[PDB]
Design a protein around this ligand. Structure first.
Ligand SMILES: CC(=O)N[C@H]1CNc2ccccc2C1
Length: 284
């Protein structure tokens, strides 16, 4: 029985290596990673892999690994797939912990934009969770944390992290992680998967996929939002992605909004992430 070596980048930046039978479905490798992580609330998470153009793709747990990675290396990342709108509802602290690690990467990467004060407040909870109570002995007036807090670090941000860290004395890691999530969950780009697209007139937009629905970012004055209930049907054809928007009460016909994606694969990817969010958040 021939087995392939899999390498998984974990959310703490460490590598997990295992073997699966070469005809294995994605669920087989995912179950192994989740057992390694002691993760029970697995529904929020998945494995990603990068293709030739270094684009992210979700490993479909129902399909053969080999038919997805195809010509590529069996190299994956462990990631949050469905960001819970209310992380307090999750049953386990260890679930909230992995969600925190994902969000820390969302912030440092700049996928999740954040004000100065929110960067410092999130960083202060991470430090409280990881080092415990503030200790002056470690930090002088010139202190810079090993922790990455932001896409661009400044001495002013490092100082503000410490000032807020002083206020969290006696906070346990679980408690600091819950405060982290209560702040992060309110950010306008929390849990938003962004896709480059063009509208029916060729104007560059972004489409955002999240728990609540689909967002169309046209300009800073113009953001269209379609709550999942308002979306009757999703489709792709060639490089195009279409959504069928319910008629208002007393209207005869649904409206259709079409978008141009860069290529056929980018249209299919957007379609599948929309279908998965629609199913998940319809049941949650
Ligand atoms: C205050 C607000 O606009 N809340 C939700 C409502 N609806 C909605 C629909 C699609 C994507 C995101 C959202 C955010």
């Amino acid at each position: 029985p021939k087995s392939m070596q899999c390498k998984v980048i974990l959310l703490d930046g460490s590598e997990y290596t295992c073997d699966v039978e070469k005809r294995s479905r994605g669920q087989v490798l995912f179950d192994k990673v989740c057992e390694h992580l002691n993760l029970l609330e697995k529904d929020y998470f998945g494995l990603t892999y990068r293709d030739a153009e270094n684009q992210k793709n979700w490993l479909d747990p129902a399909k053969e690994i080999k038919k997805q990675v195809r010509s590529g290396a069996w190299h994956f990342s462990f990631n949050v797939k469905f960001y819970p709108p209310d992380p307090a509802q999750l049953s386990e602290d260890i679930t909230r912990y992995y969600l925190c690690l994902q969000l820390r990467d969302d912030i440092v990467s700049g996928r999740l934009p954040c004000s100065f004060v929110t960067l410092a407040l999130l960083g202060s909870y991470t430090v409280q969770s990881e080092l415990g109570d503030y200790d002056p002995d470690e930090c002088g007036s010139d202190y810079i944390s090993e922790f990455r807090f932001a896409p661009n670090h400044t001495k002013e941000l490092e100082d503000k992290v410490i000032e807020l860290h002083k206020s969290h004395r006696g906070m346990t890691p679980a408690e600091a992680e819950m405060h982290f999530l209560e702040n992060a969950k309110k950010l306008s780009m929390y849990g938003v998967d962004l896709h480059h697209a063009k509208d029916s007139e060729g104007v560059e937009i972004m489409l955002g996929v999240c728990a609540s629905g689909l967002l169309i970012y046209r300009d800073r004055l113009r953001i269209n939002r379609f709550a999942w209930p308002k979306v009757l049907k999703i489709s792709y054809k060639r490089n195009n992605f279409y959504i069928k928007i319910r008629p208002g009460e007393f209207e005869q016909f649904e409206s259709t909004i079409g978008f141009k994606l860069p290529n056929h694969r980018a249209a299919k990817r957007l379609w599948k992430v929309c279908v998965e969010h629609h199913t998940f958040f319809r049941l949650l």
